[PDB]
Amino acid sequence: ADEGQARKSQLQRRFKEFLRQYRVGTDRTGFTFKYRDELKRHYNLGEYWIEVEMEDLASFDEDLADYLYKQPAEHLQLLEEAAKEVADEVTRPRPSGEEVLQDIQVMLKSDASPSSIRSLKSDMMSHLVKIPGIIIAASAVRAKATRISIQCRSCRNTLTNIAMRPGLEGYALPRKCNCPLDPYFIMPDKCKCVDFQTLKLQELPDAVPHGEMPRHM
């Protein structure tokens, strides 16, 4: 428990030294800081996303790019919280109209051989996978509360800044106000929202074992 945050404050510091130090190019020609420059050039345009590459992360610090393959959930958070502390010491002082620091959605690509939908055995639960396919559907974008704040009903006590977890998982509202049993409601005025879609991915046509209809995810 107390070693949890003490590990994190040592991972969120080694994920920050990766963006801040990784270079490319040789010594004869000349170098190029690959991710500071993209952070700056994407922030100043108003985009807020970098595209980290897994081979680079592996070649810089070999342990991190393994955690990221095994526990991607609780480590993408540290990565996206270091991308926000680096995009702060690079673009500041922001000129006039913006002075609140945005949030950086760290995507990530790779150059590794793809699996297939028929090779998703349950031992791959919560591991980065990489599958090809064909989009078959597309929902309409919706909202998804990220940082939500509630309020009691009778005594009007507030308990704010509550953070939702990402993905498709809800939240369990308390029942112990400290007032009737479940006195808590959501305050619609104070809840930050982000978009979210929901696609449908069909497996490539030349990989069906040819007795049936292709499966999808």
Give me the residues that bind another protein (CB under 8 A), please. Answer: 23, 26-27, 31
Closest approach of Cβ 150 to Zn ion, in Å?
A: 11
128 binds Zn ion (CB under 5 A): no
Closest approach of Cβ 16 to another protein, in Å?
A: 17
Distance separating alpha carbons of residues 215 and 205, to the nearest angstrom: 10
> Which tokens in the block code for residue 53?
């590459």
Closest approach of Cβ 102 to another protein, in Å?
A: 31
152 binds Zn ion (CB under 5 A): yes
> Which tokens in the block code for residue 43?
């922030």
Distance separating alpha carbons of residues 48 and 58, to the nearest angstrom: 24
Closest approach of Cβ 25 to another protein, in Å?
A: 8
173 binds Zn ion (CB under 5 A): no
Choosing among Zn ion, another protein, none, which partner's interface includes residue 27 (Cβ < 5 to 8 Å by kind)? another protein
Nearest CB to Zn ion, comparing residues 119 and 158:
158
Nearest CB to another protein, comparing residues 20 and 84:
20
Nearest CB to another protein, comparing residues 112 and 138:
112
Nearest CB to another protein, comparing residues 96 and 113:
113
Closest approach of Cβ 148 to Zn ion, in Å?
A: 18
Choosing among another protein, Zn ion, none, which partner's interface includes residue 101 (Cβ < 5 to 8 Å by kind)? none
Nearest CB to another protein, comparing residues 19 and 87:
19
Which of 144, 142, 113 has its CA nearest to residue 130? 113
151 binds Zn ion (CB under 5 A): no
Closest approach of Cβ 176 to Zn ion, in Å?
A: 10
Q: Which residues contact Zn ion (rule: CB under 5 A)?
A: 152, 154-155, 157, 177, 179, 183
